[PDB]
């Protein structure tokens with residue numbers, strides 16, 4: 001589809017069998033999801049945003065469906081104000097910015 | 100132009116007579132620029148994101164040239180780690196997310 005930006009570009013994602021809302025975020029290098037249980041071992045990571053750094057748990061090879069598109073990659077889990085789909089997964093679904 | 104997301108989508112902008120590099124950021128509601136001087140009255144505001152909130156100065160009706168495209172809108176000035184072009188100005192240049 002072709003999404004305009006007059007409103008927040010929110011889509012529905014499915015992760016761990018649950019439906020959630022997430023933001024298509026070209027400004028995020030990484031995909032960050034609010035606290036939840038994901039399978040496997042996690043690794044530590046520090047993520048810097050607009051108001052400082054937060055510590056997150058990094059999970060790899062996670063399966064996630066984004067607006068009907070399947071992606072398999074790294075997902076960070078931490079205290080984010082909203083679920084964010086970053087470039088690492090946007091590239092897998094073939095997203096581009098056009099103007 | 101059609102921008103891929105393998106790397107950060109950085110473009111050249113001209114604001115307040117100065118040339119700067121900025122991120123085309125679909126996850127940002129508003130445009131936030133690093134500390135600089137702009138003419139006009141301004142209002143204080145608090146913007147929140149990952150890591151917490153920061154205090155900024157809100158300037159209205161500011162003219163920015165994004166990748167050679169003229170646009171006008173609110174610009175926030177504050178201690179952001181990078182210059183961000185948000186949805187308020189992406190809409191003006193006709194930017195869309197496609198996949």
Ligand SMILES: CC(C)CN(C[C@@H](O)[C@H](Cc1ccccc1)NC(=O)O[C@H]1CO[C@H]2OCC[C@H]21)S(=O)(=O)c1ccc(N)cc1
Pocket residue numbers: 025026027028029030031032047048049050051081082084086124125126127128129130131146147148149180181183185
């Ligand atoms: C958290 C989102 C809802 C909003 N953020 C925009 C977002 O695109 C930022 C924009 C951004 C980009 C770089 C530095 C600071 C902020 N990215 C970000 O926080 O990404 C983090 C996770 O991936 C990592 O790679 C980028 C930093 C990490 S935001 O910077 O806090 C923001 C909030 C309000 C406005 N008006 C404009 C921007």
